[PDB]
């Protein structure tokens, strides 16, 4: 993806005006520095490889972390899958109106020992389960529930101390692209919710300890990482200026255009 | 000369005498839906002389203390002729547009407008916990207008209309990434934009989804000296291009 | 049992690797593709589109549309200065938040030329001539029009064509520069001066405005992707 190189230039005295244009046409001028001054011939070997949409987006970013405790009934986690709870991946995905990618999904699970009162605790390695429930399936209501059989719902099991688990997910959508913005309602009467929450139906993700609580409580935390592969992107969008406020909508409190200096001629 | 155009669509004609070029979309022209792209099975309606014609909206007044205006695009033409009657009887529909904003003043006036057409422009609410109601987001062929100040949070369901954030939380100078054009009163008189159909689905319901927004924002304010004409209007005419509809039922 | 031997780097999670992993939904049939207008393949197609730059940050203009208008009047002296700012596209607060300077804050290095377009939003009966200069570093900022004509300048005559382009060139000792503020890779200054006056007739307002745009040329390039310092978070968005 090599960039264009500059050609040599000579003094001119003519009726050709490359420097004079009209910006009211909505057209960006294609002038080069060899049209306004005398240049030499350089040949550039610089590439535009690190600014592709694949290289910009295909990096792992944390999207959530949730906790759950061993020594508790209904100590298990749940998360309704979205990408609008962190600030850094939300701003990168919202430079485009529509996107279409596959996923790669990594989990980082850790644990901590909680203040028990029994003498000489000694635990084995912990095993965790992460079950994915598509919209419409049965949900678990406690740790020893029937819904963790996983007859058709996909799940992973993982023992502590190994490499982190990792799956791959195709483009799972009803439309032809994912939408980051949606200017509309759910109802035909134009009441109720408004915005991108109408198009978000991706499922829930559950987490538990498979082991039973032996002698001390254990509090675990799982972090979820997203990595887009095979990316396509349409209709670029200006980058967000104000800080994000909520998850479901695009509300803001107004901020200045940039920071200020003391003069128009100060450097 | 490169300063004159003539656009003819149906039984309507637009002539202009000083103008910039015409901007077409993201490079593509509107066209009907193909067969390897479609998903609905019944046959579409293509009336195409009764709906693809220029409809003129109401006029707004450019004052000196004026901040901007906006229109939500398949909603302004929801009571316009046989285009708004086909939207009521059908469930689906897809449509490209051609927009002609026109504003004339003398050689003794000055000012500059940005005419931008932005897709999927979700607006923000004044109260940070709600979403804005429908009557604040759009009117039928009447302009909703920006403000030079900030709407208070005590208002429950309104649109945040601080003009330097453009209602969407961005920089208003960065809105030149969408298909846009300027009206400089020194050089220009009118701006013409041709937009294709942009969505993530091949057809959509035109009553619960506004997929285009037309904003007109004065960057350089209007000015004149005493004796010149104070009343300067702005007029917008929009014509659908290559419109088709599926799913005929009762009138809604 | 083929004999193998595991090397360092086993069972680690490096967040910028490139491997294959088993699918969780086997034989899934995806939605067919669609021709959507406006496909972007490279981020250097966004930076080549020009956006308006707020030269007028004067602490009561940043929360208004007055930040973008450069005031231009009819004087009684000659050789005055219109504006001036250093050419730091990712550290100076004038060019920091534009469409080019927002892409640059995701990267560490940059190189190439930079376009600066100026539009004269005055009356059609007003005239004027300006001097748009760029001076490489080593000396200070030019304090006169005489010091600014020794650099790379253009002389702009307003008329039917209302816009002019000042193209700053790539004059550097290194191949790349830093986006962050570095004195070792300083890039110089951009100033503007009155060549002649703004002469208006009677019953015409003598105070005009100028809009400024900034884009990138076809030899622009970026390197070493990082995280932007603009967005921030304390708790989860809920």
């Amino acid at each position: 993806a090599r960039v264009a190189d500059t050609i040599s230039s000579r003094p001119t005295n003519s009726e050709s005006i490359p420097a004079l244009t009209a910006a009211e046409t909505g057209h960006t001028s294609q002038v080069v520095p060899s049209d306004t001054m005398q240049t030499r011939h350089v040949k550039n070997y610089h590439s535009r490889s690190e600014s592709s949409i694949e290289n910009f987006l295909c990096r792992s970013a944390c999207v959530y972390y949730a906790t759950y405790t061993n020594n508790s009934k209904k100590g298990f986690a749940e998360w309704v899958i979205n990408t609008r709870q962190v600030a850094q991946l939300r701003r990168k995905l919202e430079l485009f109106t529509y996107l279409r990618f596959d996923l790669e999904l990594t989990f980082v699970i850790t644990s901590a020992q909680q203040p028990s009162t029994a003498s000489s605790v000694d635990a084995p390695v912990q095993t965790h389960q992460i079950m994915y429930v598509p919209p419409g399936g049965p949900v678990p209501t406690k740790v020893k529930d029937y819904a963790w059989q996983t007859s058709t719902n996909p799940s992973v099991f993982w023992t502590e101390g190994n490499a982190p688990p990792r799956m791959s997910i195709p483009f799972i959508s009803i439309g032809n692209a994912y939408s980051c913005f949606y200017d509309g309602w759910t109802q035909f009467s134009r009441n109720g919710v408004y915005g991108i929450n109408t198009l978000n139906n991706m499922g829930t993700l559950y987490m538990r300890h498979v082991n039973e609580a032996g002698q001390g409580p254990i509090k675990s935390t799982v972090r979820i990482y997203f990595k887009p592969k095979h990316v396509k992107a349409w209709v670029p969008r200006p980058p967000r200026l104000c800080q994000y406020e909520k998850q479901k909508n695009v509300n803001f409190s107004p901020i200045g255009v940039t920071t200020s200096r003391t003069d128009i001629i100060t450097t | 000369s490169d300063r004159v155009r003539s656009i003819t669509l149906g039984n309507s004609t637009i002539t202009t005498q000083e103008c910039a070029n015409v901007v077409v979309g993201y490079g593509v022209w509107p066209e009907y839906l193909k067969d390897n792209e479609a998903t609905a099975e019944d046959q579409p309606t293509q009336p195409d002389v009764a709906t693809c014609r220029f409809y003129t909206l109401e006029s707004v007044q450019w004052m000196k203390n004026s901040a901007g205006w906006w229109w939500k695009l398949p909603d302004a033409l929801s009571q316009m002729g046989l285009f708004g009657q086909n939207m009521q009887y059908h469930y689906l529909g897809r449509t490209g547009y051609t927009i002609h904003v026109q504003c004339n003043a003398s050689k003794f006036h000055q000012g500059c407008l940005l005419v931008v057409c932005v897709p999927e422009a979700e607006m923000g609410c004044s109260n940070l916990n709600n979403t804005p109601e429908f009557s604040e987001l759009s009117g039928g062929d009447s302009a909703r207008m920006f403000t030079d100040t900030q709407v208070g949070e005590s208002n429950a369901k309104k649109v945040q209309t601080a003009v330097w954030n453009a209602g969407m939380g961005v920089g208003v100078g960065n809105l030149t990434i969408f298909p846009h054009q300027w009206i400089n009163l020194r050089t220009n008189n009118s701006a013409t934009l041709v937009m294709p159909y942009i969505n993530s689905v091949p057809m959509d319901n035109m009553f619960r989804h506004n997929n285009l927004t037309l904003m007109i924002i004065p960057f350089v304010p209007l000015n004149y000296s005493e004796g010149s004409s104070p009343y300067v209007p702005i007029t917008v005419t929009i014509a659908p291009m290559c419109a088709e509809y599926n799913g005929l039922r009762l009138a809604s | 049992g083929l004999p193998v031997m595991t090397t360092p780097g086993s069972t680690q999670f490096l967040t910028s690797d490139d491997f294959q992993s088993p699918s969780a939904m086997p034989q899934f049939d995806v939605t067919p593709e669609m021709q959507i207008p406006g496909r972007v393949n490279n981020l250097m197609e966004i930076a080549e589109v020009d956006s308006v730059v707020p030269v007028n940050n004067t602490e009561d203009n940043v929360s208004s549309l007055k930040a973008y208008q450069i005031p231009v009047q009819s004087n009684s002296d000659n050789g005055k200065q219109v504006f001036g700012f250093p050419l730091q596209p990712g550290a100076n607060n004038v060019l920091n938040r534009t469409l080019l300077g927002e892409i640059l804050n995701y990267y560490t290095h940059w190189s190439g030329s930079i376009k600066l377009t100026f539009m004269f939003c005055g009356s059609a009966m007003a005239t004027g001539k300006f001097l748009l200069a760029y001076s490489p570093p080593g000396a200070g900022v030019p304090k006169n029009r005489k010091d600014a004509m020794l650099g790379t300048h253009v002389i702009w005559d307003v008329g039917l064509q209302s816009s002019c382009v000042l193209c700053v060139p790539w004059i550097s000792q290194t191949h790349y520069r830093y986006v962050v503020e570095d004195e070792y890779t300083a890039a110089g200054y951009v100033t503007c001066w009155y060549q002649t006056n703004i002469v208006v007739p009677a019953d015409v307002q003598s105070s005009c405005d100028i809009l400024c745009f900034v884009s990138a040329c076809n030899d622009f390039s970026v390197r070493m992707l990082k995280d932007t310092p603009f967005i921030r978070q304390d708790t989860f968005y809920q």
Partner: antibody, heavy 117, light 106 residues
Framework: VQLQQSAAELARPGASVKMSCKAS????????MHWVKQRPGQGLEWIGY????????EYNQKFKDKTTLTADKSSSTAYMQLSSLTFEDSAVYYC???????????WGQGTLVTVSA | DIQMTQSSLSASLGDRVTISCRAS??????LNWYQQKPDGSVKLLIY???TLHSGVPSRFSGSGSGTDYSLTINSLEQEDIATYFC?????????FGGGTKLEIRR
Amino acid sequence: VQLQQSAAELARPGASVKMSCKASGYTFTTYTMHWVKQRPGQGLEWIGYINPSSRYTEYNQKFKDKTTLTADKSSSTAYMQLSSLTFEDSAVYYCARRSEADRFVYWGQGTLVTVSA
Amino acid sequence: DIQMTQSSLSASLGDRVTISCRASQDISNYLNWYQQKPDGSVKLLIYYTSTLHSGVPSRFSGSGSGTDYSLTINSLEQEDIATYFCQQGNTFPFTFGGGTKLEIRR
């Protein structure tokens, strides 16, 4: 990041007083700054805020005519002026910085304002 | 204005303490819990119905739905002897609850 308020004050009934909240460790014009009042026999009570980027203030409907909030972008300071001081205005006043939606993560230490003669 | 009704609870060290407050209408899981130390410093504990802020120990726990909410400390220590307010973020303006001060039993 911390917010540092001024020292305790004292005033006559009918006079005016001015507090302070010097913020450091972050960019001052990015977040709004809110003011909370706590009387010693009551709970906490919200007064108003100010947008430091545009100097836009919005008050509660009870403190609308007595309180005046102001700020400066130079010294990273936010002021609050109480006017027509009565004996109900003897409390502890906190400055807090609002975050994601309705959460105040960073608080000041409070100033004791007491009226007497 | 949403009335946020919460006065002084007593418990021994190392026991389970439960502080509750009740809204006037539905606030839709938008509740926050704060802690005011006896020297006068305030800090955020739980920034949703159940989500702990970073730097808060795992003794604290939040629950509730609709109108009735609660805050639980599972093992009382000497550092948790403070005043606890609850705050809603559903309607303009922000309303806080009254305090609830913890003290030693005997």
